[PDB]
Design a protein around this ligand. Sequence first.
Ligand code: RET
Ligand code: RET
Ligand code: RET
Ligand code: K
Ligand code: K
Ligand code: K
Ligand code: K
Ligand code: K
Ligand code: K
Ligand code: K
Ligand code: K
Ligand code: K
Ligand code: K
Ligand code: K
Ligand code: K
Ligand code: K
Ligand code: K
Ligand code: K
Ligand code: K
Ligand code: K
Ligand code: K
Ligand code: K
Ligand code: K
Ligand code: K
Ligand code: K
Ligand code: K
Ligand code: K
Lengths: 259, 258, 259
Amino acid sequence: PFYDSRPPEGWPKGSINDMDYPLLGSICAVCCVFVAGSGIWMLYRLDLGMGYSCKPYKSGRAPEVNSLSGIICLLCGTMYAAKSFDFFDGGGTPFSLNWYWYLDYVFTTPLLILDFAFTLDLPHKIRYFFAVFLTLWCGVAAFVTPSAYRFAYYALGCCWFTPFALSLMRHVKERYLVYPPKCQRWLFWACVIFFGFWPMFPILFIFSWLGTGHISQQAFYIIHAFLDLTCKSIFGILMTVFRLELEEHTEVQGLPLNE
Amino acid sequence: PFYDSRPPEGWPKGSINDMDYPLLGSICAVCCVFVAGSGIWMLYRLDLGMGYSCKPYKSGRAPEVNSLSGIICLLCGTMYAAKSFDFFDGGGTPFSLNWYWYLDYVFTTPLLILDFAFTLDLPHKRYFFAVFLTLWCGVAAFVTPSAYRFAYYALGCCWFTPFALSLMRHVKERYLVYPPKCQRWLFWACVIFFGFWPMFPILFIFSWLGTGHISQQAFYIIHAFLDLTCKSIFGILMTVFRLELEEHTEVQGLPLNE
Amino acid sequence: PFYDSRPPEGWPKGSINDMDYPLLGSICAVCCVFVAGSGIWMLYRLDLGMGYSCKPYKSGRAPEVNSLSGIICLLCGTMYAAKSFDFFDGGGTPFSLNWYWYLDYVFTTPLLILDFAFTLDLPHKIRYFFAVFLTLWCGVAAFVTPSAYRFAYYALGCCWFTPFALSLMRHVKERYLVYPPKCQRWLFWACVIFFGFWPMFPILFIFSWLGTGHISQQAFYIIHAFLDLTCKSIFGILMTVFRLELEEHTEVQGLPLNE
Ligand SMILES: *C/C=C(C)/C=C/C=C(C)/C=C/C1=C(C)CCCC1(C)C
Ligand SMILES: *C/C=C(C)/C=C/C=C(C)/C=C/C1=C(C)CCCC1(C)C
Ligand SMILES: *C/C=C(C)/C=C/C=C(C)/C=C/C1=C(C)CCCC1(C)C
Ligand SMILES: [K+]
Ligand SMILES: [K+]
Ligand SMILES: [K+]
Ligand SMILES: [K+]
Ligand SMILES: [K+]
Ligand SMILES: [K+]
Ligand SMILES: [K+]
Ligand SMILES: [K+]
Ligand SMILES: [K+]
Ligand SMILES: [K+]
Ligand SMILES: [K+]
Ligand SMILES: [K+]
Ligand SMILES: [K+]
Ligand SMILES: [K+]
Ligand SMILES: [K+]
Ligand SMILES: [K+]
Ligand SMILES: [K+]
Ligand SMILES: [K+]
Ligand SMILES: [K+]
Ligand SMILES: [K+]
Ligand SMILES: [K+]
Ligand SMILES: [K+]
Ligand SMILES: [K+]
Ligand SMILES: [K+]
């Protein structure tokens, strides 16, 4: 999709691409290591067995959808390795996963909500997947649109995120009472991350360089690196622990849910 | 994928991009509203229950593949909102869903046939990929400036002609299964399918990339109407056919003619 | 994604794009015909029935995942028809499936391993799919990166292919003892192709024009056309014959596996 490139003399001074690229690349490398290691741990723990007792699977293999968390974390870590490669090369690299904002997210966070929908047995998994997909593509369109119509694209995304986030919460609540108090605690701390960090992205858009102009692109990159460390890595860890508690309750102890 | 952009002085006069952009944007906005509302109604009606009696689902939720029609209509409505944004900005916008013809279709109409294959229990749900490939052969045909675009078009005609011939046959095998009311709804859906899908290849020949009889603006209006028919009306007809099928088999418990 | 195009006077002499385009287009057309015909035969044979006896399916239709081999071969044949169109037009065509190396592969070979995972009942089908996906995208990034960081991208791909290829082999071995000796023979000849031709691509990268500079882009195109004739077409034929023998053993004769 690329047309632009870093000028031979470098990015013009004062432009949004005139960033601290060694620092951004170091942050991206650290994020890559952390998120990829978290995904590797999730896959290894999933292969260990069901619950904290590590009860062997009857088929000898874990459910395929249960690998979604670790797969998403490993894909995010690989894209952050690519981001570190792009930043350490000075930015504007032909294969830049940093250039088009939220283009990487159209790969992780839809699958992520799918994983969430598979972990909580949430209804309308395809509906939630496509809502997140369209919201992220509206964000990509807003960040590639140089006119005021980007605020239209943003609004379009806000027309896809506000219902979804309102629906998901409701559905999440319907599942929350089902689970035992310990799984409820893990789910509570995962939903705190979800419903307190997903709304941050729309707010960050308004104060970014494409909005009120209060947040620079470098600060945007650092903020979104921390958000991906939270929304992918920490949220996936919390989902893995919630799954372990649910399996210990229902598969190891055989106890029924509060449904 | 974009390399081109609207020139600072505007699109050159007499070029294919020198179109009535306020009119195209208004048409795209109306299409967005209509198709998105149709998808919202499809999802709401699906959540209402099975059949016309709105029989509650045993699990409390509808089948996931049954949301395909409304999801496709909502995705098409969102892409038409993006198209209206592009047209109202004068065209040639970096995120232009109007520039690359049939690029948007690679997202809807494959899923659409999937929905169709899921609604009629059609074999080789193959079909999807065939449509996929066909549409990509269209995309290339509209980005190739040489005569080899007619090769790409022909390649698509080598993927659409068998598929459309196979689908019909398979559709016929399912048509006798369904009751006469579901048969009526299926008949009116298949009329749209087999009478409007062939239009796109014919429209290619007489477009600016063929005989030069249809301008790009007329192409946009024609395809807006076609998307209003192939996505919106066809999805409505499929929803009504599903409602009749559920009323026959799930509410009344009657068996199919299989 | 295209920015470049063939210059009005043609590709500069001595450049990597200054290739024998009629020859490349003829090779691509022959490959298209062969691979598309192999996919058509695979789908027709699948529709014939189970096993060598062509036992009719109970539902009257074959399993959907069993069409993966023929679908992949037909998609590869269509992409090779597009490649022949691009080459016969002189290269650098806006819809060039030859320009971005391994970009076409991100469409076939993941599905291919999925097909493999479905044919051998291999665990972690999604994990293998995403590993191949990420390896191929790392290859695409390496072949679009003009700096030394391409060797980083390559290494990233080598960090995704080496574990996967090591895991797959192990899992394949666990399945190999299950199957009867005839299915074992067909599986052996398919795994020979897999584990002896998939490692070739990383080695070909090193000696290509983006590495040591020993293999030209034209030679790369011919080599990869032959590899796609082997990895898609011949491997799909071997998988179809293995499936036919397995169905003759288990569905026609009703005999159990060595599990
Ligand atoms: C790990 C990454 C995550 C969880 C990304 C989440 C993204 C969103 C909640 C998207 C937000 C936006 C929309 C509401 C539309 C306007 C633009 C965005 C992308 C900032
Ligand atoms: C709502 C949109 C629909 C139903 C689109 C349908 C598209 C086709 C039937 C595709 C037609 C073409 C081919 C046969 C190949 C040549 C190029 C196309 C895209 C016009
Ligand atoms: C029919 C095509 C096939 C089987 C393609 C296979 C591709 C690979 C085994 C990929 C190899 C590479 C990686 C290990 C990363 C570095 C770059 C590649 C793409 C050469
Ligand atoms: K995760
Ligand atoms: K996991
Ligand atoms: K990322
Ligand atoms: K990007
Ligand atoms: K940028
Ligand atoms: K970005
Ligand atoms: K799960
Ligand atoms: K997760
Ligand atoms: K629809
Ligand atoms: K629907
Ligand atoms: K559309
Ligand atoms: K487009
Ligand atoms: K155009
Ligand atoms: K278009
Ligand atoms: K359906
Ligand atoms: K539909
Ligand atoms: K194959
Ligand atoms: K096949
Ligand atoms: K190919
Ligand atoms: K390409
Ligand atoms: K090239
Ligand atoms: K290539
Ligand atoms: K299979
Ligand atoms: K195969």
